Each structure stands twice: as structure tokens, then as C-alpha cells.
């Protein structure tokens, strides 16, 4: 939008696709989760759904000051020695449809869905008939894993973004702040 950023994670053993570098792709958004910051546009610049990975670099869409000096949260650590590092730049001057990043798009509703199936004062024999498992179905959400209390290794993810605009502006805010609808950088 106003200042699009990137973060290069270098290749190594510890950043392979198993659990040292698989789970740090859709759950490591501590700059928009824990390290400080909540009003950015999530726009991953590696949206290639063939490998099920909607982001290659650490693509983030922010403003001019938020990309130049207002993006110093702890959500960019590990790239000091175990990877490379990025910096801020200008926003998309052309019309890039980069309204897709790590956002609140995901289909893991079976983690707590017994209240929507059989926790409504009934027994447990209606966990798929009254309220089905159709929302707790894993699908091809192109997005890196997550490292929360769901497995010792990484997890699943998704891309909660859509189209992008033609001007320079941060779009709408989802759970991950995925800046869909705003003209972020296309890649």
C-alpha cells in the first residue's frame, strides 16, 4: 500500500520444511500477534498455491513510516544469523492486486465443534448430523505452518486475503490483518 516490505529467510537445515522452518510461516506473526503492532496489511509476496505456500519472503504491506521506522517489532527475529534481513521501501506505484497475505482464512473448526454438534443439551451421537464436520475440514489453504499448542512440529494455515486494489493504501483488517482489497505489492 504505502510501504511494502520483505523478509528473506535463508536456506539451512534448521529452516527446512519439517518443524524448524515449516511452522514459522502462518503462526509466527508476533509483530501482529505479540511483539507489538496490530494495524498492518498482511500481503505475502510469494502467493504460489502449487506447493501450498502462499508466501515465500516475509512480505508485509505497511505505510511509509510503518515500513521505514515503525516496523521494529520482535516479529522479524531469527533472520539475524539463521537467515537474511529486509528493509522498507515505497508502496506499489502500479496497480498491484496483492490483496492476499496471512489472514484469518482457515478451516479448522473441529478443534471445538461439539457444542455446535452435540453440546446443545443433547448426547454425543449428533456430532456430524445436527452440526456436521464440514467446517472442520482441512483444505488447500496455501500458507505456512503454526507452532502453537497443537503439535510439537508445525501445523496448517491459510491465506485470508482476496483481490487487491490499484491505488496505494492498506486494505481491510482480518484476524491476521490480511490487507485484502487494498492495492498492496503484487509480489
Amino acid at each position: 500500500m504505502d510501504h511494502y516490505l520483505d523478509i528473506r529467510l535463508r536456506p539451512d537445515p534448521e529452516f527446512p520444511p519439517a518443524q524448524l522452518m515449516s511452522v514459522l510461516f502462518g503462526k509466527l506473526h508476533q509483530a501482529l500477534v505479540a511483539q507489538g503492532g496490530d494495524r498492518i496489511g498482511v500481503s505475502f509476496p510469494d502467493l504460489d498455491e502449487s506447493r501450498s505456500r502462499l508466501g515465500e519472503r516475509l512480505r508485509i504491506h505497511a505505510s511509509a513510516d510503518d515500513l521505514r521506522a515503525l516496523l521494529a517489532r520482535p516479529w522479524l527475529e531469527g533472520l539475524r544469523d539463521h537467515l537474511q534481513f529486509g528493509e522498507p521501501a515505497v508502496v506499489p506505484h502500479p496497480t498491484p492486486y496483492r490483496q492476499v497475505s496471512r489472514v484469518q482464512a482457515k478451516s479448522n473448526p473441529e478443534r471445538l465443534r461439539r457444542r455446535l454438534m452435540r453440546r446443545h443439551d443433547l448426547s454425543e451421537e449428533e456430532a456430524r448430523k445436527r452440526i456436521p464436520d464440514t467446517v472442520a475440514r482441512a483444505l488447500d489453504l496455501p500458507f505456512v505452518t503454526l507452532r502453537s499448542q497443537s503439535t510439537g512440529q508445525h501445523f496448517r494455515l491459510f491465506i485470508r486475503h482476496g483481490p487487491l486494489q490499484v491505488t496505494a493504501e492498506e486494505g481491510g483488517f482480518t484476524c491476521y490483518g490480511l490487507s485484502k482489497g487494498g492495492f498492496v505489492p503484487w509480489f
Partner: protein, 293 residues
């Protein structure tokens, strides 16, 4: 004339398991007796390893014994292949010592690669190294692990003094025993990463620990002498040098840089590789294993 059918090489640079224990940062003075880290559950039944929430610093401690005598195989059928293998290493050691190898070994103790998933995400990692000729410490060290580059190797007079010690052990000049102690600020009650049992966690005195061979894998990322590309950093010295996480290999047998192909040239066929390629040949003899036919 030919390789023996049996070639067993006793390994050198033998590590131990690494106990883990918590504790507060700047409590490094009285840092001997800590409570360790247990393996508890949460619910579906998994096994997690976390600090006590009052502490912020993981303490990792193992020992390392540098053996030396890297040329002699433990089991070898033919003596003429055995003798010329000892002649070939004696060509190597006399031309140059183990210093360039051990200076690359002197890094892996300093910038703590044995903190595999614990160094990534940390903010202050300090490694103590002690040389113990007796029960007393005969020589001490003190090294930042984040200032020393994980991907790039650089020298230091403190490191080179430590490099000459490991060079003295590998050359058989004496006895070298090391006490590696690593303090690392991760945070309050955070998830440390022990080694993953085949799913429990490897604990010993009900104290979660890392495998010994999983530390020795971190102490041998020295091979920057790729066929392809040094841009990804160092990779552990193995014959048919391959990484499970990257998925691809390096050093194909179709390439003429294979360790078996190098060893047949450098010993049998009397064809010397480059000096930068000679360091890869010796650093698998320190690894050891069943070689030959």
C-alpha cells in the same frame, strides 16, 4: 592396491548428552545447582518441555572428549591398504596440521549450533567452555554466540587459542576434555526444544535432554566445500553430503567430488584433490563408520 572389505573407523570428538536446566539470567555466579526441566503433558496426550515460569535462561551442559589418532582404522582386512592409508594421512598431517579443521571446529562450540531450535528465537546466548586436565579447570573460556556469525566463519585469538587445543587433541599431542555450558535467554516459561523420541521426549534422570549424536551433528557443520553453492551456509560433513530438511543431496557419485571417489583418488590412485578438498576427506575419518566393500 584396493580398499579392504572391512573399514571400521573409531570416531573422534565424542560428545555426551546435554542436560537442560532453567535459572534466571545474571545468576551465572551461583549457576551450579539448578532445577532441571521435566517432561509433562497437556490435553490428545502430548509431551511438552517448558521452563519454570520464574526463570528465563536455559542452561545446557555436556562434555566433549577429543581423542585423536584419526588415521588408524579400528578394523581393516589388508595391511598394505592399511599402511598406505597411514602413509597418506602422514602426508596430510606433516604438510598441514589439524588447525584449519579445528578452527572450524572451534566455531561450533562458540556460536551454539547445538542449540538447534533454541538459538533461533533467542536474544542473548552465552557459552562457557572449560578445559579440565584434572577435576579442576585448567583453562577457561567465555564466548558470545550471537556476535559470532552462525552462517559466516571468522577467526579470533581467543578462538585460535581454543583451536590449537582441539588441534592438540586430534594430533595426539595430549588429552583434551571440554565442559561446554550454554546459557540462553529465551524467556519466562517458554518452550525449549529437546530431542524427539520415537512420542515422548528424551529424558534421563527425568530431566529432558538432547541425544549425543544430535549434538555431534551440530559440531561438524564444516563442509563449505560444496560442488554446487556455498551461499546456503555450512552443512555437516558426511559422505554423500545430504540434508534431510532441504531434501536434496550434494556431492553426487556422478560428480567426481564424492568422498569415496576422493578417497580412492587420494589413497589408491595417488590423485591428490585440492587442499580445500583435503579437509573434507579427513573430517569424515573423525566421523567414522563402516567404509570399504
Amino acid at each position: 592396491l584396493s580398499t579392504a572389505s572391512v573399514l571400521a573407523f573409531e570416531r573422534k570428538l565424542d560428545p555426551s548428552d546435554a542436560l537442560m536446566s532453567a535459572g534466571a539470567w545474571a545468576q551465572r555466579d551461583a549457576s551450579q545447582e539448578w532445577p532441571a526441566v521435566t517432561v509433562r503433558e497437556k490435553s490428545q496426550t502430548v509431551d511438552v518441555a517448558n521452563l519454570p515460569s520464574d526463570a528465563d535462561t536455559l542452561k545446557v551442559r555436556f562434555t566433549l572428549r577429543v581423542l585423536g589418532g584419526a588415521g588408524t582404522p579400528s578394523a581393516c582386512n589388508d595391511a598394505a591398504y592399511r599402511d598406505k592409508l597411514l602413509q597418506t594421512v602422514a602426508t596430510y598431517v606433516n604438510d598441514q596440521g589439524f588447525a584449519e579443521l579445528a578452527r572450524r571446529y572451534a566455531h561450533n562450540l562458540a556460536n551454539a549450533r547445538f542449540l538447534w531450535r533454541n538459538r533461533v528465537g533467542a536474544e542473548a546466548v552465552e557459552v562457557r567452555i572449560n578445559h579440565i586436565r584434572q577435576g579442576e579447570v585448567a583453562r577457561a573460556w567465555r564466548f558470545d554466540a550471537l556476535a559470532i556469525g552462525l552462517r559466516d566463519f571468522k577467526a579470533d585469538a581467543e578462538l585460535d587459542a581454543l583451536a590449537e587445543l582441539i588441534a592438540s587433541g586430534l594430533s595426539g599431542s595430549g588429552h583434551v576434555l571440554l565442559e561446554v555450558v550454554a546459557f540462553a535467554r529465551i524467556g519466562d516459561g517458554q518452550e525449549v526444544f529437546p530431542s524427539q523420541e520415537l512420542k515422548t521426549l528424551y529424558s534421563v534422570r527425568d530431566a529432558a535432554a538432547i541425544h549425543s549424536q544430535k549434538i555431534g551433528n551440530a559440531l561438524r557443520t564444516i563442509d563449505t566445500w560444496y560442488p554446487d553453492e556455498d551461499g546456503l551456509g555450512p552443512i555437516a560433513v558426511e559422505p554423500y553430503g545430504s540434508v534431510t530438511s532441504q531434501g536434496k543431496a550434494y556431492r553426487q557419485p556422478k560428480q567426481k567430488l564424492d568422498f569415496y571417489t576422493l578417497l580412492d583418488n587420494w589413497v589408491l590412485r595417488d590423485e591428490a584433490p585440492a587442499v580445500e578438498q583435503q579437509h573434507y576427506v579427513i573430517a569424515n575419518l573423525i566421523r567414522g563408520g563402516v567404509f570399504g566393500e
